[PDB]
């Protein structure tokens, strides 16, 4: 009886929040860039951060201000303190009484008055000024909330009797659901009233807190003169279950919304979203008497696209059906056939609009598996698309491939595992890939009824491969397209973007070709080779792209010597930069050959000498323009004895330098415990030659346990002026890195250092000297000295002499930070703590997140400005009551010393102060 | 109809906090004076305080007018079968501020 | 304004109100209510 | 049809009303076609 | 004490309905006039 009472009882969960807060600022800069970075790269926790960490948009705690109640993001350029503070953002008044906001330090540059608006002289001269000061008037807030949770025992459903011509028994199937429900008192700030059914908040839908006054917030509170507060009670629930399965042994029928299914690639790659609402039936004949050892299986799908959706949507009156059948006659070779169809009904043929084909009918067969020591992967498809309209003129498009290679479990092809193995280690000829491709030009995700895909995933990386992990397009080979200059509006000149990149028009050409990658394992020797030619579907050599190559390695004792030859002959246009540095579209010929020798004495040390020679379009081509990466079979070898693996990808980042110019911390990464500067490569294949010693601390029997350094020298070829055939190895790069953690006593030291003396502009790094050093100390609590002190520390210096074609400017930075925590302070359970941080910078800047996956970074700019961010943060604690105080100042002067901080132009820095009293309480 | 609670939620225990350090937690027990329950209908003097002053300004909301069917005779949320529906509110009063 | 005539011949619409005149907006002022009903296929989950 | 407790119901019906001549007035858009109705349902009763 | 707890306790009753439906017609006639009539005069049950 007690269990029955508990099953359908409410758990009452009240919550109380108590806290005092005051904050005064004049510019709202950011202070999270001063705090130490943890070994996982996260910044140390403080009581002043505004938050804002978003992985989707790349936002971090360092992209927003931390004072007042405002989280104003930092603004790049001069409007912000070069990414250090908030923008100036004048306000512009209009004649009709409307207003706009101008984001700049000079309103005169407001070059965007709308068509009919005229600046009315209402403010200073029609331009106002948005106040840069934010205030949080000191107050103590008590927040009270209450929720009612359920026992969570309603996770099952049992079927009931049904039928009209008959009556089912009932209680035959038990389904596990994922319903999470309870009672809430108040609505979240992000709730809304969805009046359209799209499931998303359109333009100002309802603001559910505004629909139910008194639900939450401060705008409305349903009160009582006696002091009572009333809040509406809502029933909140999530239903994560949309599929219901019936039947156990041979036959299982699943009914639900947005059914996800997969016949094969090129036909019903309809998982990762699903296609619509309906049912799927799966029949497994693995226990049949006569034929059950072949594991016969049948799948059948019926559904309506997107369920019910309004007209003008692609899935209105459109229904899909399909059936697949497969077996495994041999060890693992599964062979299957499948029929798929999608079409409009009489209500979709009329009043649907869009462009969905009147009918698509695809047939196919596949032979994936591993049977007799070899792995086969084949696929055939036929489309027969009915292109709506009136005449239609049904169009057919096939897609066939046959590959002898190893597919992973995620259906991506692993080209590093042979799958042939025609011998042992002494004589070990290994076939890695052997494939043919006949994808037609018109075969897209509509031809074979899928969600996405069947197009080059990169067009710059391996562009014959359609495999797209983002959209779940599991398909080995892609529908290639031909690229050409656009010339949309202007005539005579090709259209370009603002950055100068070309604008291309892509026409699908399909794909047809073959490719073999193999390697023969000798004894102390090993050899490998690859060949690959792909044309358009029609076979015209105007779209051919052939890559051939081969490598040979000899490794013995502690010496290894490799030699690689790579070619790329692309009559296919290809987009790339020329010698001058302007993007172009046109055929390419790349010839590379690299001989690199390595010696490993075994004491953790290593030495490496290399000579790599690129040759683009017949000229020596100081740097290849990424063309060699257009093929998916690169297959270089690796140094070391007994390492005869022919792994795909030309390891161009081997024994060469790094060209990074961005960093999370103020100093050039030498103060970031999540960045190993000695393992930073450029990943660009150069025409150069050089040597590089080093030392690894993770390798056992090393001189120093945790020590890594990467001293190295190199010389890079550069043409005579810009495009001359003649040239010389005039460029010179001398680089060095070091990293040493150690733990002397109770403290935990960490040293990092980097150097560079480049002579030319390699990828984006200018030509000049570049050095950096950083030290991090973190003492554990001392149990001998009174107060149990626990110290910290941080120092970082960065220097760079950027010799760019527009200046010879020096960009240096200096970051420091110290702090001591007293874990035993007078009264019991009393703690005190103080941390002082500082960051000075010459011509450097911060670039905030771009709103995409890219994050913000500190870089060098020629802005003649010196930033002087400083702050002190004192955190004391009684038993569990935390007093946090913080005072920070940001001043950005110029060479003269004008002190542009606090940009009202009064010669005063921006200042921020905060005081908080925090107290966490639980019921 | 009203729904009263057991009245056993008269205590709070502090939790660990701090950024430069971390307090032990469960160190202090505070006696609070929160009286809460569930009501079905609103009183006559209830109102929607849209300014924060805590007092009824000139015709603020007349909370019975905001939620029709809460109380009174002006509005009654009914059903042809004879059922009567009244919104459920979570009423609470906090007398503790220190 | 619009009205609905329930008959197989709109010419027999002997009931134009006091001041209303048939505007030649449809075929000749008379439309035609579609006789086709559609329930687009969907799977519905209702929770209470 | 019915599997354990999942009921598949399908129905196709046709209504044609001709005159003596054979004008086939059904589906009264006057195109000589009968009225037609088709339905497909999948029903599943579940209990907590 | 258990009886006192049960006297003023809530019984939580959740309900879930799952079902797929599609229907296409051009005139919307009636089909219940075709089904057999039961001994009590009611027409046989159907899913349409
Ligand atoms: C145990 C249950 C027994 C069966 C119950 C009675 C049903 C059979 C009687 C004939 C009834 C089925 C006859 C086939 C109609 N045809 C369909 O497929 C249409 C497809 O829509 C649209 O597609 C376009 C391109 O695709 C075009 O063709 C359009 O023109 C078409 N729309 C239109 O204009 C409407 C004709 O679906 P629908 O909207 O009519 O949906 C319902 C259908 C039919 O229902 C079933 O019978 C399925 C039962 C499967 C249970 C499998 C589970 C087994 C459990 C052990 O369901 C399908 O999907 C299947 C497709 C037909 C194959 C049938 C053989 C298993
Ligand atoms: C385990 C079991 C799982 C069960 C669930 C899976 C169900 C599998 C169903 C398999 C049925 C056989 C398929 C035959 C394939 C013929 C190959 C094929 O699809 N033909 C293509 C297409 O066809 C049109 C289609 O033909 P269709 O015969 O498919 O439909 C008839 C009937 C549907 O009945 C209803 C409900 O009205 O369905 C059946 C078979 O019962 C049709 O007439 N619809 C009129 C409307 C035209 C637009 C779709 O016309 C051209 C393009 O307009 C062209 O592109 C052709 O290549
Ligand atoms: C009968 C019965 C009963 O009444 C009482 C009691 O016995 C039961 C209840 C168990 C029962 C029910 C039994 C029930 C379970 C049904 C049996 C199960 C099987 C599974 C059904 C399907 C069998 C068909 C089979 C799967 C097809 C095989 C063909 C291959 C797919 C062909 C592939 C070839 C490809 C194209 C080559 C590659 C070519 C390219 C170019 C692509 O490389
Ligand atoms: Cu911040
Ligand atoms: Cu739809
Ligand atoms: Cu997929
Ligand atoms: Fe919406
Ligand atoms: Fe008020």
């Amino acid at each position: 009886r007690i269990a029955a009472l508990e099953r359908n009882a409410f758990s009452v969960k009240p919550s109380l929040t108590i806290g005092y807060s005051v904050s005064r600022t004049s510019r709202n800069f950011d202070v999270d860039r001063l705090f130490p970075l943890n070994a996982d790269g996260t910044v140390a926790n403080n009581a002043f951060t505004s938050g804002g960490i978003d992985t989707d948009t790349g936002a971090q705690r360092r992209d927003f201000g931390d004072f007042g109640n405002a989280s104003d993001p930092v603004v790049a350029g001069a409007a912000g303190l070069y990414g250090f503070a908030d923008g100036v953002s004048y306000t512009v008044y209009f004649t009709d009484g409307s207003t706009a906001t101008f984001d700049g330090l000079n309103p005169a540059d407001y070059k965007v008055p709308t068509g009919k608006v005229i600046d009315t002289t209402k403010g200073r001269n029609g331009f106002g000024f948005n106040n840069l000061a934010r205030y949080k008037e000191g107050s103590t807030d008590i927040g009270i909330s209450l929720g009612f949770d359920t026992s969570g025992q309603f996770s099952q459903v049992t079927s009931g009797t049904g039928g009209s011509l008959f009556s089912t028994a009932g209680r035959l199937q038990v389904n596990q659901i994922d319903l999470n429900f309870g009672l809430v008192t108040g609505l979240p700030s992000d709730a809304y009233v969805d009046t359209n059914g799209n499931g998303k908040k359109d333009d100002g839908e309802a603001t559910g807190r505004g629909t139910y006054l008194g639900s939450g917030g401060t705008a409305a509170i349903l009160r009582d003169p006696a002091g009572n507060v009333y809040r509406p009670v809502f029933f909140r629930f999530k239903n994560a279950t949309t599929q219901f399965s019936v039947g156990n042994n041979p036959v299982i029928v699943t009914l639900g919304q947005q059914q996800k299914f997969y016949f094969s690639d090129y036909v019903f790659d309809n998982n990762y979203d699903g296609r619509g609402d309906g049912f799927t039936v799966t029949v497994d004949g693995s226990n049949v008497p006569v034929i059950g050892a072949w594991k016969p299986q049948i799948k059948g799908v019926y559904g309506s696209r997107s369920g019910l959706d309004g007209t003008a949507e692609a899935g209105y009156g459109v229904y899909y059906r399909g059936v697949r059948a497969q077996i495994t006659p041999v060890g693992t070779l599964t062979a299957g056939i499948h029929y798929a169809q999608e079409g409009r009904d009489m209500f979709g043929a009329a009043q649907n609009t869009t462009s969905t084909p009147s009918d698509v009918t695809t047939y196919g067969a596949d032979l994936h598996g591993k049977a007799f020591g070899v792995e086969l992967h084949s696929e055939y498809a036929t489309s027969r698309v009915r292109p709506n309209t009136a005449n239609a003129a049904v169009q057919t498009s096939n897609a066939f491939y046959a590959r002898v290679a190893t597919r992973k479990d995620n259906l991506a092809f692993d080209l590093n595992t042979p799958a042939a193995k025609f011998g042992n280690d002494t004589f070990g000829v290994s076939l890695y890939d052997l494939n043919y491709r006949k994808i037609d030009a018109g075969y897209n995700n509509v031809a074979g009824i899928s969600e996405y895909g069947y197009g080059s995933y990169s067009r710059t990386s391996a562009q014959n491969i359609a495999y797209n992990p983002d959209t779940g397009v599991t398909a080995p080979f892609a529908n290639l397209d031909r690229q050409a200059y656009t010339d949309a509006n202007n005539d005579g000149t090709s259209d370009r973007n603002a950055d100068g990149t070309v604008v291309a028009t892509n026409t699908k050409i399909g794909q047809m070709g073959f490719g073999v990658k193999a390697a023969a394992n000798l004894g102390p020797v090993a050899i490998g080779g690859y060949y690959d030619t792909s044309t358009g579907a029609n076979g015209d050599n105007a779209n051919r792209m052939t890559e051939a190559g081969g490598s040979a390695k000899v490794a013995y004792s502690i010496f290894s010597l490799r030699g690689t030859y790579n070619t790329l002959d692309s009559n296919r246009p290809q987009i790339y930069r020329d010698a001058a540095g302007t993007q172009i579209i046109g055929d390419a010929k790349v010839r590379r050959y690299a001989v690199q020798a390595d010696v490993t004495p075994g004491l953790g040390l290593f030495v490496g000498a290399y000579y790599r020679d690129v040759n683009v379009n017949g000229v020596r081509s100081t740097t290849d323009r990424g063309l060699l990466g257009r093929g998916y079979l690169a297959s270089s070898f690796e140094p070391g004895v007994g390492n005869n693996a022919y792994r795909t990808g030309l390891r161009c980042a081997d024994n060469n330098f790094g060209t990074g110019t961005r960093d999370i911390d103020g100093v050039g990464g030498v103060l970031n415990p999540a960045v190993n500067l000695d393992q930073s490569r450029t990943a660009t294949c150069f025409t150069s030659y050089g040597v590089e010693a080093g030392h690894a601390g993770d390798n056992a029997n090393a001189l120093v346990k945790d020590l890594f350094f990467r001293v190295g020298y190199s010389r890079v070829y550069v043409p005579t002026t810009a495009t001359a055939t003649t040239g010389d190895f005039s460029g010179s790069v001398t680089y060095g890195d070091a990293r040493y953690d150690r733990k002397v006593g109770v403290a935990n030291v960490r040293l990092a250092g980097s150097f560079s003396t480049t002579n030319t502009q390699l990828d984006s790094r200018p030509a000049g000297t570049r050095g950096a050093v950083g030290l991090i100390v973190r003492t554990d609590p001392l149990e001998n000295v009174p107060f149990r002190p626990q110290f910290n520390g941080q120092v970082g210096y960065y220097t760079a002499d950027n010799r760019v074609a527009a200046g010879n400017y020096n960009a240096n930075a200096t970051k420091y930070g110290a702090g001591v925590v007293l874990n035993d302070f007078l009264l019991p359970q009393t703690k005190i703590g103080v941390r002082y941080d500082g960051y000075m910078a010459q011509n450097r800047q911060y670039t905030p997140f771009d709103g995409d996956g890219t994050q913000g970074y500190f870089s060098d700019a020629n802005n003649n400005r010196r930033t002087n961010l400083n702050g002190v943060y004192v955190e004391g604690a009684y038993q569990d009551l935390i007093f946090s105080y913080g005072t920070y100042t940001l001043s950005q002067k110029d060479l003269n010393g004008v002190e542009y901080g606090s940009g009202i132009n009064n010669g005063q820095p921006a200042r921020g102060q905060t005081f908080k009293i925090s107290y966490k309480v639980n019921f």
Side-chain angles (χ1 to χ4, degrees), chain A residues 626-639:
Chain A
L627 297 162
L628 282 176
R630 300 292 200 278
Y632 65 107
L633 309 174
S635 309
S636 77
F637 268 117
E638 167 151 333

PDB file of all heavy atoms in Angstrom, chain A residues 626-639:
ATOM      1  N   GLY A 626      47.531  23.816 -52.433  1.00  0.00           N
ATOM      2  CA  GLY A 626      46.535  22.880 -51.964  1.00  0.00           C
ATOM      3  C   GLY A 626      46.002  21.944 -53.019  1.00  0.00           C
ATOM      4  O   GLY A 626      45.056  21.198 -52.743  1.00  0.00           O
ATOM      5  N   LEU A 627      46.578  21.958 -54.222  1.00  0.00           N
ATOM      6  CA  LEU A 627      46.072  21.119 -55.301  1.00  0.00           C
ATOM      7  C   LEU A 627      46.295  19.640 -55.023  1.00  0.00           C
ATOM      8  O   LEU A 627      45.428  18.816 -55.330  1.00  0.00           O
ATOM      9  CB  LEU A 627      46.728  21.513 -56.621  1.00  0.00           C
ATOM     10  CG  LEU A 627      46.440  22.936 -57.090  1.00  0.00           C
ATOM     11  CD1 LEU A 627      47.456  23.367 -58.130  1.00  0.00           C
ATOM     12  CD2 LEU A 627      45.030  23.032 -57.635  1.00  0.00           C
ATOM     13  N   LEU A 628      47.435  19.284 -54.428  1.00  0.00           N
ATOM     14  CA  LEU A 628      47.728  17.881 -54.176  1.00  0.00           C
ATOM     15  C   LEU A 628      46.703  17.225 -53.265  1.00  0.00           C
ATOM     16  O   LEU A 628      46.624  15.993 -53.238  1.00  0.00           O
ATOM     17  CB  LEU A 628      49.122  17.732 -53.570  1.00  0.00           C
ATOM     18  CG  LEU A 628      50.294  17.844 -54.543  1.00  0.00           C
ATOM     19  CD1 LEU A 628      51.614  17.770 -53.800  1.00  0.00           C
ATOM     20  CD2 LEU A 628      50.213  16.767 -55.609  1.00  0.00           C
ATOM     21  N   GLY A 629      45.927  18.006 -52.526  1.00  0.00           N
ATOM     22  CA  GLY A 629      44.887  17.490 -51.668  1.00  0.00           C
ATOM     23  C   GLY A 629      43.565  17.230 -52.350  1.00  0.00           C
ATOM     24  O   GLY A 629      42.611  16.825 -51.680  1.00  0.00           O
ATOM     25  N   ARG A 630      43.469  17.450 -53.662  1.00  0.00           N
ATOM     26  CA  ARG A 630      42.225  17.189 -54.371  1.00  0.00           C
ATOM     27  C   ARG A 630      41.934  15.705 -54.528  1.00  0.00           C
ATOM     28  O   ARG A 630      40.779  15.341 -54.771  1.00  0.00           O
ATOM     29  CB  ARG A 630      42.247  17.851 -55.750  1.00  0.00           C
ATOM     30  CG  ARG A 630      42.411  19.353 -55.704  1.00  0.00           C
ATOM     31  CD  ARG A 630      41.191  20.022 -55.111  1.00  0.00           C
ATOM     32  NE  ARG A 630      41.116  21.431 -55.470  1.00  0.00           N
ATOM     33  CZ  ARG A 630      41.779  22.398 -54.853  1.00  0.00           C
ATOM     34  NH1 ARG A 630      42.582  22.145 -53.835  1.00  0.00           N
ATOM     35  NH2 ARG A 630      41.633  23.653 -55.268  1.00  0.00           N
ATOM     36  N   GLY A 631      42.939  14.845 -54.393  1.00  0.00           N
ATOM     37  CA  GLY A 631      42.726  13.416 -54.499  1.00  0.00           C
ATOM     38  C   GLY A 631      42.595  12.743 -53.152  1.00  0.00           C
ATOM     39  O   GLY A 631      43.129  13.232 -52.153  1.00  0.00           O
ATOM     40  N   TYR A 632      41.883  11.620 -53.106  1.00  0.00           N
ATOM     41  CA  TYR A 632      41.654  10.918 -51.853  1.00  0.00           C
ATOM     42  C   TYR A 632      42.669   9.813 -51.590  1.00  0.00           C
ATOM     43  O   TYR A 632      42.639   9.216 -50.510  1.00  0.00           O
ATOM     44  CB  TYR A 632      40.236  10.339 -51.821  1.00  0.00           C
ATOM     45  CG  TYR A 632      39.968   9.274 -52.857  1.00  0.00           C
ATOM     46  CD1 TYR A 632      39.861   7.942 -52.493  1.00  0.00           C
ATOM     47  CD2 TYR A 632      39.806   9.601 -54.194  1.00  0.00           C
ATOM     48  CE1 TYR A 632      39.614   6.967 -53.432  1.00  0.00           C
ATOM     49  CE2 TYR A 632      39.561   8.632 -55.138  1.00  0.00           C
ATOM     50  CZ  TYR A 632      39.465   7.317 -54.751  1.00  0.00           C
ATOM     51  OH  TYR A 632      39.218   6.344 -55.689  1.00  0.00           O
ATOM     52  N   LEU A 633      43.560   9.530 -52.534  1.00  0.00           N
ATOM     53  CA  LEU A 633      44.640   8.565 -52.344  1.00  0.00           C
ATOM     54  C   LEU A 633      45.961   9.328 -52.381  1.00  0.00           C
ATOM     55  O   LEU A 633      46.450   9.690 -53.454  1.00  0.00           O
ATOM     56  CB  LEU A 633      44.598   7.475 -53.410  1.00  0.00           C
ATOM     57  CG  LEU A 633      43.268   6.757 -53.635  1.00  0.00           C
ATOM     58  CD1 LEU A 633      43.364   5.823 -54.822  1.00  0.00           C
ATOM     59  CD2 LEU A 633      42.854   5.997 -52.391  1.00  0.00           C
ATOM     60  N   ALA A 634      46.534   9.575 -51.206  1.00  0.00           N
ATOM     61  CA  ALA A 634      47.831  10.226 -51.085  1.00  0.00           C
ATOM     62  C   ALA A 634      48.908   9.268 -50.605  1.00  0.00           C
ATOM     63  O   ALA A 634      49.937   9.110 -51.264  1.00  0.00           O
ATOM     64  CB  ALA A 634      47.732  11.422 -50.132  1.00  0.00           C
ATOM     65  N   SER A 635      48.694   8.621 -49.461  1.00  0.00           N
ATOM     66  CA  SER A 635      49.412   7.403 -49.104  1.00  0.00           C
ATOM     67  C   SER A 635      50.929   7.623 -49.091  1.00  0.00           C
ATOM     68  O   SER A 635      51.668   7.142 -49.947  1.00  0.00           O
ATOM     69  CB  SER A 635      49.022   6.269 -50.055  1.00  0.00           C
ATOM     70  OG  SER A 635      47.615   6.146 -50.127  1.00  0.00           O
ATOM     71  N   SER A 636      51.368   8.411 -48.120  1.00  0.00           N
ATOM     72  CA  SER A 636      52.783   8.497 -47.797  1.00  0.00           C
ATOM     73  C   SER A 636      53.145   7.443 -46.752  1.00  0.00           C
ATOM     74  O   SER A 636      52.281   6.820 -46.136  1.00  0.00           O
ATOM     75  CB  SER A 636      53.138   9.897 -47.293  1.00  0.00           C
ATOM     76  OG  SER A 636      52.729  10.070 -45.950  1.00  0.00           O
ATOM     77  N   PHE A 637      54.445   7.246 -46.563  1.00  0.00           N
ATOM     78  CA  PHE A 637      54.953   6.318 -45.562  1.00  0.00           C
ATOM     79  C   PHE A 637      55.331   7.066 -44.289  1.00  0.00           C
ATOM     80  O   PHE A 637      55.302   8.296 -44.223  1.00  0.00           O
ATOM     81  CB  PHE A 637      56.156   5.537 -46.102  1.00  0.00           C
ATOM     82  CG  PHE A 637      55.789   4.236 -46.753  1.00  0.00           C
ATOM     83  CD1 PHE A 637      56.039   4.025 -48.096  1.00  0.00           C
ATOM     84  CD2 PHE A 637      55.186   3.229 -46.027  1.00  0.00           C
ATOM     85  CE1 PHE A 637      55.698   2.837 -48.699  1.00  0.00           C
ATOM     86  CE2 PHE A 637      54.846   2.036 -46.627  1.00  0.00           C
ATOM     87  CZ  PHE A 637      55.102   1.841 -47.964  1.00  0.00           C
ATOM     88  N   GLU A 638      55.694   6.300 -43.263  1.00  0.00           N
ATOM     89  CA  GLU A 638      56.003   6.889 -41.975  1.00  0.00           C
ATOM     90  C   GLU A 638      57.365   6.423 -41.479  1.00  0.00           C
ATOM     91  O   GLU A 638      57.754   5.276 -41.720  1.00  0.00           O
ATOM     92  CB  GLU A 638      54.927   6.525 -40.946  1.00  0.00           C
ATOM     93  CG  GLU A 638      55.302   6.830 -39.513  1.00  0.00           C
ATOM     94  CD  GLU A 638      54.094   7.143 -38.659  1.00  0.00           C
ATOM     95  OE1 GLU A 638      53.081   7.614 -39.218  1.00  0.00           O
ATOM     96  OE2 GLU A 638      54.153   6.918 -37.433  1.00  0.00           O
ATOM     97  N   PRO A 639      58.108   7.280 -40.784  1.00  0.00           N
ATOM     98  CA  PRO A 639      59.442   6.894 -40.321  1.00  0.00           C
ATOM     99  C   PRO A 639      59.379   5.831 -39.236  1.00  0.00           C
ATOM    100  O   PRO A 639      58.380   5.672 -38.532  1.00  0.00           O
ATOM    101  CB  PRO A 639      60.020   8.205 -39.779  1.00  0.00           C
ATOM    102  CG  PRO A 639      58.825   8.997 -39.388  1.00  0.00           C
ATOM    103  CD  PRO A 639      57.762   8.655 -40.389  1.00  0.00           C
TER     104      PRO A 639
END
